[PDB]
Amino acid sequence: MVEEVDENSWEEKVLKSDKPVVVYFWAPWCGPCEEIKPIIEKLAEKYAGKVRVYRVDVDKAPGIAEKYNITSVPAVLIFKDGKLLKKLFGVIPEEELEKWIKEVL
Question: Number of structural domains, the chain?
Fold first, then answer.
């Protein structure tokens, strides 16, 4: 359910979305990304058709990571209508992340 987004598709998928967008930043070398991965997948399914959930491998898209000052992973950013609303870094409780998704709905 959680599709990768990059520099090429970022404008159309993230910035031009009609629904809020959650972007999960991860890296194959990051242990804690294994901990949060099932949370991201669960919320993508729960909110399907309400928010879009995308992922960015920071090694594949280092320009996106630099643009949004993704200075560690895992990180989750929440956008609405082209505007960044919240940055969350680290392993934070799933109820916290869900609370922020509900705020944009």
Answer: 1
The coordinates were experimentally obtained by X-ray
* Resolution in units of Å: 1.4
**Beta carbons of 84 and 54 less than 8 angstroms apart:** no
Q: Which residues are catalytic?
A: 30, 33
Domain with 89, as residue range(s), is: 3-103
SS3 assignment, position 55: strand
Four-point Cα dihedral 54, 50, 40, 75, nearest 10:
60
Residue 17: which CATH number?
3.40.30.10
Pairing of strands 75-80, 83-89: antiparallel
Sheet holding 21-26, edge to edge: 3-4, 52-57, 21-26, 75-80, 83-89
Do the strands 52-57 and 21-26 form a parallel or antiparallel pair, or are they unpaired? parallel
